[PDB]
Amino acid sequence: PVIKVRENEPFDVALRRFKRSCEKAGVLAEVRRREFYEKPTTERKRAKASAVKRHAKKLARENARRTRLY
Amino acid sequence: MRHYEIVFMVHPDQSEQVPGMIERYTAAITGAEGKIHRLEDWGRRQLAYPINKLHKAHYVLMNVEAPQEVIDELETTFRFNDAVIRSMVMRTKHAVTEASPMVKAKDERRERRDDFANETADDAEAGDSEEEEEE
Amino acid sequence: ARYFRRRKFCRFTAEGVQEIDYKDIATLKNYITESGKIVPSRITGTRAKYQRQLARAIKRARYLSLLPYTDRHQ
Amino acid sequence: AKAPIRARKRVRKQVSDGVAHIHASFNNTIVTITDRQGNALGWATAGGSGFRGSRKSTPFAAQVAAERCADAVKEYGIKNLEVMVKGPGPGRESTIRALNAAGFRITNITDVTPIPHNGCRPPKKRRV
């Protein structure tokens, strides 16, 4: 998943980030493991859950200021 | 009756087969009191991946109404046509039979996106330059 | 003044383009990268219906070789 | 010291230009030079460099596998290369760098890595 689309002016290092959009996730990610049929619906779909801790972290920066520790 | 938007694509060199087949399929529809509400041929287009070989196909939008009993037989028919490489038919829900979403993409094809070659001349007699027996 | 109703850039900041149509090639390509593939739904802030119906339409379209299915088809 | 040897003149297929294929797995890398019309002009490996263990699946053992095959094909009379990449394994860039150190322009790094439409079930590995 270095991705076929060529970075402007050719160089030895592939610009892997700007190319990739939805590759590996689910298909070539659960490597050397038993593939399940309905398991992904609860195992993998953790985007909302992982978003909360990041909202909390960005809240507390302002709250260290309001308590005055900084 | 209920409306089914069948789109199919055809192998360039095999296009010569379709002008005899298409007029029996239209007689089978109207023979069931359904209707041909457009029948748009789009010309030749590049496939992303080949299907039964060649990177090119010629795309034809029939725009049927036919009863529910008949479309299950016609859909099986259009998929197992050899001249046809693959086919898809969409639902009655949120369907247009007027005002085509591909009207511009069609015209663009004839003007600009064919080969303009002998292998796409073969398409144009099965294309908008269509010939069929009268019902 | 009243009843202007959906000029531009109003109801939603991002326009919904198609639902379930695939016969226009251009409507699908509205959410398709230069890699030739769908962008995830979290990043764009698309509304779930237009996306849920596009999940069928995009797979349908790919199977008719209106799209590459696979990186080998780029 | 030097001997009075005849002149060398030999031909093999003189292809001047090629494609390379890189198959990256989880335990090894396999690195292979071919003609552009599709015929093997040599190969090397990272397992045949004898690193073994985890060290066998690293960008550096993969690089030196690429420099081993790329040396051998001068005798085939190849002079330019292009490369095909196929896998998620290590040597993403390091394999490329070793063909580029073989003196080739490597402008086309075409990922062709096959994404099956969800293929065949991989091995369970450990029983927990």
Query: Which distant-in-sequence residues (6+ apart) come within 8 Å of D16 by Cβ?
Result: D77, D78, D79, D80
Element (H, E) at B122: helix B118-124
Q: How far apart are CA B50 and CA B12, in angstroms?
A: 12
Is residue D36 a contact partner of residue D101, using CB atoms and an 8 Å limit?
no
Query: Which distant-in-sequence residues (6+ apart) come within 8 Å of A31 by Cβ?
Result: D26, D88, D122
Contacts B86 to C, Cβ<8 Å: 63-65
Phi-psi label, residue D38: left if phi above 0, alpha if psi -120 to 50, beta otherwise? left
Interface check for A32 against chain D (CB to CB < 8 A): the answer is yes
Is residue D65 a contact partner of residue D49, using CB atoms and an 8 Å limit?
yes
Residue D109 pairs with which residues in a beta bridge? D83
Residues in chain A followed by a break, C to N above 2.5 angstroms? none
| Contact (CB<8Å) B7/C64 | yes
- Of chain C, the end-to-end C-alpha distance in Å amounts to 50
In a domain, C40, yes or no: yes
What CA–CA distances, in Å, run from A62 to A52, A54, A66, C5?
16, 14, 6, 41
Phi-psi label, residue D28: left if phi above 0, alpha if psi -120 to 50, beta otherwise? beta
Is residue C66 a contact partner of residue B48, using CB atoms and an 8 Å limit?
yes
Contacts A23 to C, Cβ<8 Å: 35, 37, 71
Element (H, E) at A42: helix A40-43
Overall resolution, Å: 12.1
Q: How far apart are CA D88 and CA D111, in angstroms?
A: 10
What CA–CA distances, in Å, run from D90 to A15, D25, D32, D62?
16, 8, 16, 7
Which amino acid is located at A14 in the chain?
Answer: A
Strand residue runs (E) in C1-74: none
What CA–CA distances, in Å, run from D114 to C26, C31, D23, D24?
26, 23, 11, 12
| Contact (CB<8Å) A21/C71 | no
Is residue D96 a contact partner of residue A14, using CB atoms and an 8 Å limit?
yes
Assign 3-class secondary structure to B47-61. Answer: CCCCCCCCCEEEEEE
> Which of D85, D100, D122 is nearest residue A12 as measured by Cβ atoms?
D100
Q: State the smallest CA–CA distance between residue C18 and chain B in angstroms.
A: 10
> Which of C19, C24, C70 is nearest residue B105 as measured by Cβ atoms?
C24
Interface check for C31 against chain B (CB to CB < 8 A): the answer is no
Place of tokens 């071919």: D34
Place of tokens 């993998």: A44
Render D60-91 in DSSP notation, one character per residue.
Answer: HHHHHHHHHHHHHTTTTTB---EEEEE-SSS-
Q: How far apart are CA D91 and CA D22, in angstroms?
A: 9
Render chain D in DSSP notation, one character per residue.
Answer: ----PPPP---S---B-EEEEEEE-SS-EEEEEEETTS-EEEEEESTTTT--GGGGSSHHHHHHHHHHHHHHTTTTTB---EEEEE-SSS-TTHHHHHHHHTT-----EEE-----SS-SPPP--S--
Sign of CA dihedral C27, C33, C37, C40: negative
Using CB atoms within 10 Å of the CB of residue C38, give its burial: 0 to 12 exposed, 13 to 18 middle, 19+ buried.
Answer: buried
In a domain, C9, yes or no: no
Which amino acid is located at B25 in the chain?
Answer: Y
3-state class (DSSP) for residue B12:
helix
Q: State the smallest CA–CA distance between residue D115 and chain C in angstroms.
A: 5
Q: How far apart are CA B11 and CA B68, in angstroms?
A: 28
Domain span at C33: 19-73
Q: Closest residue of D to A30, CA-based?
A: D122
3-state class (DSSP) for residue B4:
strand
Tallying the residues shown for chain C, one arrives at 74
Q: How far apart are CA C1 and CA B57, in angstroms?
A: 50
Report the 10 Å Cβ neighbour count for D118: 9
| Contact (CB<8Å) A3/D108 | no
How far, in whole angstroms, is CA C18 from its chain's centroid?
6
Is residue D105 a contact partner of residue D70, using CB atoms and an 8 Å limit?
no
Q: How far apart are CA B47 and CA C66, in angstroms?
A: 6
In a domain, C36, yes or no: yes
What CA–CA distances, in Å, run from D103 to B94, C63, D67?
59, 42, 10
Place of tokens 């002016």: A9
Contacts C74 to D, Cβ<8 Å: 111-112
Domains identified in chain C, total number: 1
Dihedrals phi, psi of C61, to nearest 5 degrees: -50, -50
* Chains D and C make contact, 3+ CB pairs within 8 Å: yes
Dihedrals phi, psi of D50, to nearest 5 degrees: 65, 20
Q: Would you state the structure tokens that stand for residue B67, as one six-digit string?
A: 């009863």
In a domain, C10, yes or no: no
What CA–CA distances, in Å, run from B34 to B2, B37, B125?
9, 9, 25
Comparing C-alpha atoms, which of B87, B12, B13, B15 is closest to residue B56?
Answer: B12
The technique by which this structure was obtained is cryo-EM
